[PDB]
Coordinates of C-alpha atoms and ligand atoms in Angstrom, one line a residue:
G1 CA -1.0 24.0 -1.3
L2 CA 0.3 24.7 -4.8
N3 CA 1.2 28.4 -4.0
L4 CA 4.1 27.3 -1.8
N5 CA 6.1 26.0 -5.0
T6 CA 7.6 23.4 -2.5
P7 CA 10.4 21.4 -4.2
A8 CA 10.4 17.8 -4.2
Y9 CA 13.4 17.3 -2.1
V10 CA 11.6 18.8 0.9
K11 CA 10.3 15.9 2.8
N12 CA 9.7 17.8 6.1
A13 CA 5.9 18.0 7.0
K14 CA 6.3 20.4 9.9
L15 CA 8.7 22.7 8.0
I16 CA 6.1 22.8 4.9
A17 CA 3.3 23.8 7.4
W18 CA 5.2 26.5 9.0
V19 CA 6.3 28.1 5.7
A20 CA 2.5 27.9 4.8
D21 CA 1.5 29.6 7.9
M22 CA 3.9 32.5 7.3
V23 CA 2.9 32.9 3.6
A24 CA -0.6 33.0 5.0
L25 CA 0.4 35.9 7.2
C26 CA 3.0 37.6 5.2
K27 CA 1.2 37.2 1.9
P28 CA 4.1 37.5 -0.7
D29 CA 3.2 37.6 -4.3
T30 CA 5.2 34.4 -4.9
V31 CA 7.2 32.0 -3.0
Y32 CA 10.8 30.9 -4.0
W33 CA 12.8 28.2 -2.5
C34 CA 16.6 29.0 -2.6
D35 CA 18.6 26.0 -3.7
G36 CA 21.9 27.7 -2.9
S37 CA 23.2 27.1 -6.3
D38 CA 26.0 29.3 -7.8
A39 CA 23.6 30.0 -10.8
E40 CA 20.9 31.2 -8.4
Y41 CA 23.3 33.3 -6.6
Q42 CA 24.4 35.1 -9.9
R43 CA 20.5 35.5 -10.9
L44 CA 19.8 37.1 -7.5
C45 CA 22.8 39.2 -7.9
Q46 CA 21.5 40.2 -11.3
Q47 CA 18.1 41.0 -10.0
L48 CA 19.7 43.2 -7.3
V49 CA 21.5 45.0 -10.1
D50 CA 18.4 45.4 -12.2
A51 CA 16.7 46.9 -9.3
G52 CA 19.6 49.3 -8.5
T53 CA 20.4 47.8 -5.2
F54 CA 23.8 46.5 -6.5
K55 CA 26.4 48.2 -8.8
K56 CA 28.7 45.6 -10.5
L57 CA 32.2 46.5 -9.7
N58 CA 34.8 46.6 -12.3
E59 CA 35.8 43.1 -13.3
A60 CA 39.5 44.0 -13.8
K61 CA 39.9 45.7 -10.3
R62 CA 37.4 43.4 -8.2
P63 CA 36.3 40.5 -10.1
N64 CA 32.6 39.2 -9.5
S65 CA 32.1 41.8 -6.9
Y66 CA 29.1 44.1 -6.1
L67 CA 28.6 47.3 -4.2
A68 CA 25.4 47.9 -2.3
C69 CA 24.4 51.4 -0.5
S70 CA 21.7 51.5 2.1
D71 CA 19.1 53.9 3.1
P72 CA 20.7 56.3 5.6
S73 CA 18.2 55.2 8.4
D74 CA 19.1 51.5 7.9
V75 CA 23.0 51.3 8.5
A76 CA 23.5 49.1 11.6
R77 CA 21.8 46.9 14.2
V78 CA 19.3 48.8 16.3
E79 CA 19.7 47.6 19.8
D80 CA 16.7 49.6 21.1
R81 CA 14.5 47.7 18.8
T82 CA 16.0 44.3 19.6
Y83 CA 14.0 42.1 22.1
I84 CA 14.3 38.9 24.2
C85 CA 10.7 38.0 24.7
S86 CA 11.1 35.2 27.2
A87 CA 8.2 34.0 29.2
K88 CA 9.6 35.8 32.3
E89 CA 11.1 39.2 32.3
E90 CA 14.0 37.9 34.7
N91 CA 15.1 35.5 32.0
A92 CA 15.8 38.5 29.7
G93 CA 17.6 40.4 32.3
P94 CA 19.1 44.0 32.5
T95 CA 21.2 43.7 29.3
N96 CA 18.1 42.9 27.1
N97 CA 14.9 44.6 26.2
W98 CA 11.9 42.6 27.3
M99 CA 8.2 42.5 26.3
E100 CA 5.7 39.9 27.5
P101 CA 5.6 37.5 24.6
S102 CA 1.7 37.7 23.9
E103 CA 1.9 41.5 23.7
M104 CA 4.9 41.2 21.4
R105 CA 3.0 38.7 19.1
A106 CA 0.0 41.2 19.1
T107 CA 2.2 44.0 18.2
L108 CA 4.0 42.1 15.5
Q109 CA 1.1 40.4 13.9
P110 CA -0.5 43.5 12.3
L111 CA 2.9 44.6 11.0
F112 CA 3.8 41.2 9.3
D113 CA 0.0 40.8 8.0
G114 CA 0.7 41.5 4.3
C115 CA 4.2 42.7 4.7
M116 CA 5.3 41.0 1.6
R117 CA 2.5 42.1 -0.6
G118 CA 4.1 42.7 -4.0
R119 CA 7.3 40.9 -3.3
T120 CA 8.8 37.5 -3.5
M121 CA 9.3 35.5 -0.4
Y122 CA 12.7 33.8 -0.5
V123 CA 12.8 30.7 1.5
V124 CA 16.4 30.4 2.6
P125 CA 17.5 27.1 4.2
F126 CA 20.8 27.2 6.0
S127 CA 23.1 25.1 8.2
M128 CA 25.1 26.8 11.0
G129 CA 28.1 24.7 11.2
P130 CA 29.2 22.1 8.7
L131 CA 26.5 20.3 7.0
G132 CA 25.0 17.0 8.5
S133 CA 27.4 17.3 11.3
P134 CA 26.5 16.3 14.8
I135 CA 27.0 19.8 16.2
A136 CA 25.5 21.9 13.5
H137 CA 21.8 23.3 13.7
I138 CA 19.6 24.1 10.9
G139 CA 17.6 27.3 10.3
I140 CA 15.1 28.5 7.7
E141 CA 14.9 32.2 7.0
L142 CA 11.8 33.5 5.2
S143 CA 12.7 37.1 3.7
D144 CA 11.7 39.4 1.0
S145 CA 15.0 40.7 0.5
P146 CA 17.3 39.2 -2.2
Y147 CA 20.1 41.0 -0.6
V148 CA 19.7 38.8 2.5
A149 CA 19.4 35.7 0.2
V150 CA 22.6 36.4 -1.6
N151 CA 24.5 37.3 1.6
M152 CA 23.1 34.3 3.5
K153 CA 24.7 32.2 0.6
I154 CA 28.1 33.5 1.4
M155 CA 27.6 33.5 5.3
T156 CA 26.1 30.0 5.9
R157 CA 25.8 26.6 4.1
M158 CA 22.7 27.5 2.3
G159 CA 20.2 25.7 0.1
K160 CA 19.0 22.3 -1.2
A161 CA 21.7 20.2 0.9
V162 CA 19.9 21.3 4.2
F163 CA 16.9 19.2 3.5
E164 CA 18.8 15.9 3.2
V165 CA 20.0 16.6 6.9
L166 CA 16.4 17.7 8.0
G167 CA 14.7 14.6 6.7
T168 CA 11.1 14.1 7.5
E169 CA 11.0 15.1 11.0
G170 CA 14.2 17.2 12.0
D171 CA 14.0 20.5 13.8
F172 CA 14.8 23.7 12.6
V173 CA 15.2 27.3 14.0
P174 CA 12.3 29.4 12.4
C175 CA 13.1 32.8 11.1
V176 CA 11.0 35.4 9.5
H177 CA 12.2 38.7 8.0
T178 CA 10.6 41.5 6.1
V179 CA 11.9 44.9 5.1
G180 CA 8.3 46.1 6.0
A181 CA 7.7 47.9 2.4
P182 CA 4.7 46.2 0.7
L183 CA 4.4 47.3 -2.7
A184 CA 1.2 48.1 -4.5
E185 CA 0.4 47.1 -8.2
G186 CA 2.6 49.3 -10.5
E187 CA 4.5 50.9 -7.6
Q188 CA 8.0 51.7 -8.3
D189 CA 10.4 50.1 -5.7
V190 CA 13.3 52.0 -4.0
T191 CA 16.9 50.7 -4.1
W192 CA 16.9 49.8 -0.4
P193 CA 13.5 48.9 1.0
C194 CA 13.1 49.4 4.7
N195 CA 10.8 50.9 7.3
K196 CA 11.4 53.3 10.0
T197 CA 9.5 51.1 12.4
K198 CA 11.8 48.2 13.2
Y199 CA 11.6 45.2 15.5
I200 CA 14.1 42.3 16.0
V201 CA 12.5 39.9 18.2
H202 CA 13.6 36.6 19.7
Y203 CA 11.2 34.0 21.4
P204 CA 13.5 31.8 23.1
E205 CA 11.3 29.0 24.1
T206 CA 10.3 28.3 20.6
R207 CA 13.6 29.6 18.9
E208 CA 11.6 32.0 16.8
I209 CA 13.1 35.1 15.3
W210 CA 11.1 37.7 13.8
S211 CA 12.7 40.8 12.0
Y212 CA 10.7 43.7 10.7
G213 CA 11.8 47.0 8.9
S214 CA 15.7 46.6 8.4
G215 CA 17.4 44.8 5.6
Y216 CA 20.8 45.5 7.1
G217 CA 23.5 43.2 8.4
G218 CA 22.8 41.7 12.0
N219 CA 19.2 42.9 11.8
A220 CA 18.4 40.9 8.6
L221 CA 21.1 38.2 8.2
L222 CA 19.3 36.1 10.9
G223 CA 22.0 33.2 11.2
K224 CA 24.7 35.6 12.3
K225 CA 23.7 37.4 15.6
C226 CA 20.0 36.4 16.2
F227 CA 20.7 32.6 15.8
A228 CA 24.2 32.0 16.2
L229 CA 24.4 34.1 19.3
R230 CA 21.0 34.9 20.9
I231 CA 19.1 31.7 20.3
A232 CA 22.2 29.6 20.4
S233 CA 23.2 30.9 23.8
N234 CA 20.0 29.6 25.1
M235 CA 20.4 26.3 23.7
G236 CA 23.8 26.2 25.1
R237 CA 22.6 26.9 28.5
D238 CA 20.2 24.2 28.5
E239 CA 22.4 21.5 26.6
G240 CA 25.7 22.3 28.3
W241 CA 27.6 24.2 25.6
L242 CA 28.7 27.8 24.8
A243 CA 27.6 30.3 22.0
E244 CA 30.2 33.0 22.1
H245 CA 31.2 36.3 20.3
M246 CA 34.8 35.0 19.6
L247 CA 37.2 34.6 17.0
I248 CA 38.9 31.1 16.7
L249 CA 42.5 30.8 15.6
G250 CA 45.2 28.2 15.1
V251 CA 48.8 29.1 16.1
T252 CA 51.6 26.6 15.1
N253 CA 55.2 27.1 16.4
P254 CA 58.3 26.2 14.3
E255 CA 58.2 22.6 15.9
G256 CA 54.7 22.0 14.4
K257 CA 53.2 22.3 17.8
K258 CA 49.6 23.7 17.1
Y259 CA 47.4 25.6 19.6
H260 CA 44.0 27.1 19.4
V261 CA 42.6 30.2 21.2
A262 CA 39.2 31.9 21.2
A263 CA 39.1 35.5 21.7
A264 CA 36.4 38.0 22.5
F265 CA 37.1 41.7 21.5
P266 CA 34.4 44.5 21.8
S267 CA 33.7 46.7 18.8
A268 CA 36.7 48.6 17.3
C269 CA 39.1 46.4 19.2
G270 CA 40.3 43.9 16.4
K271 CA 38.8 40.4 16.2
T272 CA 39.2 40.3 12.4
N273 CA 42.7 41.5 12.5
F274 CA 43.7 39.1 15.2
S275 CA 42.1 36.3 13.8
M276 CA 44.1 36.8 10.6
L277 CA 47.4 37.9 12.3
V278 CA 50.5 37.7 10.3
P279 CA 53.6 36.8 12.5
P280 CA 56.1 39.6 12.2
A281 CA 59.9 39.4 12.0
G282 CA 61.4 37.2 14.6
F283 CA 58.8 34.5 14.1
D284 CA 60.1 32.5 11.0
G285 CA 58.4 29.1 11.3
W286 CA 55.2 30.2 12.9
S287 CA 51.8 30.4 11.4
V288 CA 48.5 31.8 12.3
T289 CA 45.2 30.4 10.6
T290 CA 41.7 31.3 10.9
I291 CA 39.0 29.1 12.1
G292 CA 36.6 31.9 12.6
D293 CA 36.4 35.6 13.1
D294 CA 33.3 36.2 14.9
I295 CA 31.2 33.4 16.4
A296 CA 32.4 30.1 18.3
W297 CA 30.2 27.3 19.3
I298 CA 32.1 25.6 22.1
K299 CA 31.1 22.1 23.7
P300 CA 33.1 20.1 26.4
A301 CA 34.0 16.5 25.3
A302 CA 34.3 13.4 27.2
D303 CA 38.2 13.7 26.8
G304 CA 38.1 16.8 29.3
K305 CA 38.6 19.4 26.3
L306 CA 36.6 22.4 25.0
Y307 CA 35.9 21.9 21.2
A308 CA 35.0 25.0 19.2
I309 CA 33.5 25.2 15.8
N310 CA 32.9 28.3 13.6
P311 CA 29.1 28.1 12.6
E312 CA 29.3 30.5 9.9
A313 CA 30.7 30.0 6.4
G314 CA 32.0 33.5 5.5
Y315 CA 33.0 36.8 6.9
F316 CA 30.8 40.0 7.3
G317 CA 33.5 42.2 8.4
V318 CA 33.7 46.0 9.0
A319 CA 35.5 47.5 6.0
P320 CA 37.1 50.8 7.3
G321 CA 40.5 50.4 8.8
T322 CA 41.3 47.4 6.7
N323 CA 44.5 47.6 4.7
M324 CA 47.6 45.7 4.0
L325 CA 49.4 47.0 7.0
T326 CA 46.5 46.1 9.6
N327 CA 45.3 42.9 7.8
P328 CA 46.7 41.8 4.5
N329 CA 44.9 38.5 4.8
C330 CA 41.6 40.4 4.9
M331 CA 42.7 42.5 2.1
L332 CA 43.6 39.5 0.0
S333 CA 40.4 37.9 0.9
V334 CA 38.1 40.7 -0.7
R335 CA 40.2 40.9 -3.9
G336 CA 37.0 39.2 -5.5
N337 CA 33.9 37.5 -5.1
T338 CA 32.9 40.1 -2.4
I339 CA 29.6 42.1 -1.5
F340 CA 30.5 45.5 -0.2
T341 CA 27.8 47.6 1.6
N342 CA 28.2 51.2 2.1
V343 CA 31.9 51.6 1.1
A344 CA 32.7 54.4 -1.6
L345 CA 33.3 54.0 -5.4
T346 CA 36.6 55.0 -7.0
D347 CA 36.9 56.7 -10.5
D348 CA 38.1 53.4 -11.9
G349 CA 35.1 51.4 -10.5
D350 CA 36.8 49.9 -7.5
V351 CA 36.0 50.5 -3.9
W352 CA 37.6 52.5 -1.1
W353 CA 37.1 52.9 2.5
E354 CA 39.1 55.1 5.2
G355 CA 42.2 53.4 6.1
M356 CA 43.1 52.1 2.6
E357 CA 45.2 55.3 1.9
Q358 CA 47.8 53.6 4.3
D359 CA 48.8 51.4 1.3
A360 CA 49.0 54.2 -1.1
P361 CA 52.2 55.9 -2.0
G362 CA 52.8 58.7 0.5
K363 CA 49.5 57.7 2.2
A364 CA 47.6 60.1 0.0
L365 CA 43.9 60.2 -0.1
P366 CA 42.1 59.6 -3.4
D367 CA 41.4 62.9 -5.2
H368 CA 37.8 62.1 -5.7
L369 CA 35.2 59.3 -4.8
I370 CA 31.4 58.9 -4.7
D371 CA 30.6 58.2 -1.1
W372 CA 28.2 55.8 0.4
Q373 CA 25.4 58.3 0.0
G374 CA 26.0 58.9 -3.7
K375 CA 27.7 62.2 -3.2
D376 CA 30.9 63.6 -4.7
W377 CA 33.6 63.1 -2.1
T378 CA 37.1 64.9 -2.1
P379 CA 39.5 65.3 0.8
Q380 CA 38.4 69.0 0.9
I381 CA 34.7 68.1 1.0
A382 CA 35.7 65.7 3.8
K383 CA 37.3 68.6 5.6
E384 CA 34.5 71.0 5.0
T385 CA 31.4 68.6 5.6
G386 CA 33.0 65.8 8.0
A387 CA 31.6 63.3 5.6
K388 CA 33.5 59.8 5.6
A389 CA 33.6 58.2 2.2
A390 CA 32.6 54.8 3.6
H391 CA 30.1 54.6 6.4
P392 CA 31.7 53.6 9.7
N393 CA 29.6 50.4 9.8
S394 CA 30.2 49.6 6.1
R395 CA 30.8 45.9 5.3
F396 CA 32.4 43.3 3.1
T397 CA 30.8 39.8 2.7
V398 CA 33.2 37.2 1.5
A399 CA 33.5 33.4 1.8
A400 CA 35.9 31.9 4.4
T401 CA 37.8 30.0 1.5
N402 CA 38.9 33.5 0.0
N403 CA 41.2 33.8 3.2
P404 CA 44.9 32.7 2.4
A405 CA 45.2 32.0 6.0
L406 CA 42.1 29.7 6.4
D407 CA 42.8 27.0 8.8
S408 CA 42.6 23.5 7.3
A409 CA 40.1 22.5 9.9
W410 CA 37.9 25.4 9.7
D411 CA 34.9 23.3 8.5
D412 CA 35.9 20.2 10.6
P413 CA 32.7 19.1 12.5
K414 CA 34.9 17.6 15.4
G415 CA 36.0 21.3 16.2
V416 CA 39.4 22.2 17.7
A417 CA 40.3 22.0 21.2
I418 CA 40.7 25.6 22.9
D419 CA 43.8 26.0 24.9
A420 CA 43.3 29.7 26.0
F421 CA 40.5 32.3 26.0
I422 CA 41.4 35.9 25.4
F423 CA 39.2 38.7 26.5
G424 CA 40.4 42.2 24.9
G425 CA 39.3 45.7 25.4
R426 CA 40.4 49.2 24.7
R427 CA 41.7 51.0 27.9
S428 CA 43.9 54.1 27.8
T429 CA 44.9 53.3 31.4
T430 CA 44.8 50.6 34.1
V431 CA 44.6 47.5 32.3
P432 CA 48.1 45.8 31.4
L433 CA 49.0 44.7 28.0
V434 CA 48.3 41.1 28.9
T435 CA 47.3 39.4 32.1
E436 CA 46.9 35.8 32.9
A437 CA 44.1 34.8 35.2
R438 CA 45.3 32.7 38.2
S439 CA 42.0 30.5 38.1
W440 CA 39.0 29.9 36.0
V441 CA 36.8 31.9 38.3
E442 CA 39.1 34.9 38.1
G443 CA 39.2 34.6 34.3
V444 CA 35.4 34.7 34.3
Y445 CA 35.6 37.8 36.5
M446 CA 38.0 39.3 34.0
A447 CA 35.6 38.5 31.2
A448 CA 32.6 39.8 33.1
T449 CA 34.2 43.1 33.7
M450 CA 35.9 43.9 30.5
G451 CA 35.4 47.4 29.0
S452 CA 36.3 49.7 26.1
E453 CA 36.6 53.4 25.7
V454 CA 34.3 56.9 28.2
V455 CA 34.7 53.4 29.4
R456 CA 31.7 51.3 28.5
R457 CA 31.4 47.6 30.0
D458 CA 30.7 44.9 27.6
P459 CA 30.8 41.6 29.4
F460 CA 32.2 38.8 27.4
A461 CA 31.7 41.2 24.5
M462 CA 28.2 39.8 24.7
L463 CA 26.2 42.9 25.8
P464 CA 24.1 43.1 22.7
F465 CA 23.9 39.4 22.0
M466 CA 23.1 37.5 25.4
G467 CA 19.9 35.4 24.7
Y468 CA 19.1 35.3 28.5
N469 CA 19.9 36.9 31.8
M470 CA 23.6 38.1 31.8
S471 CA 24.1 36.8 35.3
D472 CA 22.8 33.4 34.6
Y473 CA 25.4 33.4 31.7
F474 CA 28.1 34.2 34.1
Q475 CA 26.9 31.2 36.2
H476 CA 26.8 29.0 33.1
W477 CA 30.6 29.9 32.6
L478 CA 31.3 29.0 36.1
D479 CA 29.5 25.7 36.2
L480 CA 30.9 24.8 33.0
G481 CA 34.4 25.2 34.4
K482 CA 33.7 23.3 37.6
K483 CA 32.1 20.4 35.6
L484 CA 35.2 20.2 33.3
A485 CA 37.8 20.4 36.2
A486 CA 35.6 17.7 37.9
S487 CA 36.3 15.3 35.2
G488 CA 40.0 16.0 35.9
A489 CA 40.4 18.1 32.8
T490 CA 42.9 20.9 32.3
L491 CA 40.9 24.2 31.9
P492 CA 41.9 26.4 29.2
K493 CA 43.9 29.5 30.3
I494 CA 42.2 32.9 30.5
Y495 CA 44.0 36.0 29.5
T496 CA 42.8 39.8 29.3
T497 CA 44.8 41.9 26.8
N498 CA 44.8 45.6 25.9
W499 CA 46.5 46.8 23.0
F500 CA 45.6 50.6 23.7
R501 CA 47.4 51.9 26.8
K502 CA 48.6 55.4 26.1
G503 CA 52.0 56.9 27.0
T504 CA 52.7 60.2 28.5
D505 CA 52.3 61.8 25.1
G506 CA 48.8 60.4 24.7
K507 CA 49.8 58.1 21.8
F508 CA 49.4 54.4 21.8
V509 CA 52.6 52.8 23.0
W510 CA 52.0 49.1 21.9
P511 CA 52.4 49.1 18.1
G512 CA 49.9 46.2 17.8
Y513 CA 48.8 44.4 14.6
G514 CA 51.3 41.8 13.7
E515 CA 53.3 42.6 16.9
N516 CA 50.4 41.0 18.9
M517 CA 52.2 37.7 18.0
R518 CA 54.7 38.4 20.7
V519 CA 51.9 38.5 23.3
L520 CA 50.3 35.3 21.7
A521 CA 53.7 33.6 21.9
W522 CA 54.0 34.3 25.7
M523 CA 50.4 32.9 26.2
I524 CA 51.7 29.7 24.3
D525 CA 54.9 29.5 26.5
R526 CA 52.4 29.7 29.5
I527 CA 50.1 26.9 28.2
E528 CA 53.5 24.5 27.9
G529 CA 54.4 25.6 31.4
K530 CA 57.6 27.2 30.2
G531 CA 56.7 30.8 30.5
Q532 CA 57.6 32.9 33.3
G533 CA 55.6 35.9 34.7
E534 CA 55.1 38.3 37.5
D535 CA 52.3 37.8 39.9
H536 CA 50.2 41.0 40.7
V537 CA 47.0 42.1 42.2
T538 CA 44.8 40.8 39.4
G539 CA 46.8 37.9 37.8
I540 CA 50.2 37.1 36.1
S541 CA 51.8 39.4 33.6
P542 CA 55.0 38.8 31.7
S543 CA 58.0 40.7 32.4
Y544 CA 60.0 42.4 29.4
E545 CA 62.5 39.6 29.3
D546 CA 59.7 37.1 29.0
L547 CA 58.8 38.2 25.5
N548 CA 60.5 37.7 22.1
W549 CA 61.7 41.1 20.8
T550 CA 63.5 39.8 17.8
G551 CA 62.7 42.1 14.9
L552 CA 61.0 44.9 17.0
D553 CA 62.7 48.1 18.5
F554 CA 60.5 48.2 21.7
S555 CA 62.3 49.2 25.0
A556 CA 61.8 47.9 28.6
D557 CA 60.4 51.3 29.7
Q558 CA 57.8 51.2 27.0
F559 CA 56.8 47.7 27.9
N560 CA 56.7 48.6 31.6
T561 CA 54.4 51.6 30.5
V562 CA 51.9 49.2 29.1
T563 CA 52.2 46.4 31.4
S564 CA 52.8 47.5 34.8
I565 CA 50.0 47.4 37.6
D566 CA 49.1 50.5 39.6
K567 CA 47.1 50.0 42.8
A568 CA 45.5 53.5 42.8
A569 CA 44.1 52.9 39.2
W570 CA 42.9 49.4 40.3
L571 CA 41.3 51.0 43.2
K572 CA 39.3 53.3 40.9
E573 CA 38.6 50.3 38.6
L574 CA 36.9 48.1 41.2
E575 CA 34.6 51.2 42.1
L576 CA 33.6 50.9 38.3
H577 CA 33.2 47.2 38.7
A578 CA 30.9 47.9 41.7
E579 CA 28.7 50.1 39.5
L580 CA 28.6 47.4 36.9
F581 CA 27.5 44.9 39.4
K582 CA 24.6 47.0 40.7
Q583 CA 23.4 47.3 37.1
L584 CA 23.5 43.5 37.1
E585 CA 22.6 42.7 40.8
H586 CA 20.1 39.9 39.9
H587 CA 21.6 36.5 40.2
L588 CA 25.2 37.8 40.3
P589 CA 27.1 34.7 41.1
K590 CA 28.8 34.8 44.5
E591 CA 32.2 33.7 43.0
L592 CA 32.6 37.1 41.3
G593 CA 32.1 38.8 44.7
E594 CA 34.7 36.6 46.0
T595 CA 37.1 37.4 43.3
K596 CA 36.4 41.3 43.8
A597 CA 37.0 40.8 47.6
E598 CA 40.2 39.1 46.9
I599 CA 41.6 41.7 44.5
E600 CA 40.7 44.3 47.1
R601 CA 42.7 42.3 49.7
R602 CA 45.6 42.2 47.5
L603 CA 45.4 45.9 46.9
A604 CA 45.5 46.5 50.6
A605 CA 48.3 44.1 51.7
Ligands
LIG1 MN1 30.6 40.4 15.9

């Protein structure tokens, strides 16, 4: 009908009929199709300013940037409200919340019925992956949040170009989102509409994503987690590829040899820092470049290699902790053209977040700020009330092309061949600085059992993002490796890393940040077959002499403190693995049991 305002370039009848069904359900006042243009982005930003959702930052301090502050009830992903509604509960598994699909549809129907009354529905077309490419997938998100529209513009390839790829019959992932705050005639809107009742629902068989009540981050920017991980992991299982919670980086040595690694880190462990790593002193001629900092789509090719693409177009990164010491490439990235969410406002109209004082003379805190809740903030107020100036989950949104270390192949549809996988974690004890798995299966075991500090397990860093049963996902990784090795291929190395072993004084021994290059360089030597290492109960680890210490005062005893293996600690660690496996017993692959038994055998030898 005429009420869809369908542009002429939309030729896809199934898509129009679907938009019509959701407009019939959600009943927005008007329907607007986002063309993705720069002018439209500025218009929507101005609408957000007019509503009070955005404040324009000072154009001298932070050009063409905006600050949004959210309702305190709507500040993060809500995992207890996130559902995998597969036909069978066993295909959701113990790491996912399940509900019978017909029961969830009956639950969501009255909530979405009229949810957009009084609001504009934004039709947000987007490609995950480079446009028109053989490995990209198209999504359409219907949303009543202009905040969602402008952030999706930065985070994805958004707008009119999508429809030339879809053509008249192409498929798309259907996404529906509402803040769940319908407006009556003459009602004054709030600056951050949301609902205390929240649902983030995935129907894997139909690829549907339904989001109700949150306008924040991973709940509402449906391309990032709901599509590019949860739905995408299901597609990869059926089609022979991988959707992973991994950065992708390129590392080039002084001879121009270039390697790519994919690395999964749990929350507060350093994917953005590592993906933008700056080589320290002693690594002249080396360069590290960013393909992606969060999501990897990885497909084996006929040539026996695993090719990864970053399906996103920008960064939606955690702000606190970012400074010129931990991550100068990220700091340079957010110099302008950035949307900041829930960070603090300085007196000169700039932004601030915990950790930025590391760049200030004397590392001094600012005298005064307006915090993410609009309150006066001072160091003394922070001391008295405990309030952080920026919310811990505060964010920047910025285009990938703002990154000075952006890899030249970041949008190459052919992807990059992965030479190694890295699985991080934060462990005060037990886990060495770096360990190389002796085999693919033993690497999958490492990824399956990774944890972060008590110690919480987060297999493959996918605990909140697996689109199906975690144990079947383990099996997918094992089968994929077997099939690759069967074609004669050389499987990528797998490493576990741990930056956070504590010394006898309780401090972190490993300096981390740019010095992580020294561990990465050892991996490179191993990939080339020229690196040495010590074999131990769980794998191979470098000796002190195997790393390049040029430019860092770091002693053998410090290195052995973070890298040496202790049988007593690993006996206790395997007990914790046993607890994890009981929480995951259904369809747990036998190969993981064989790996645990082999570690136990080496511990007793
Ligand atoms: Mn992430």
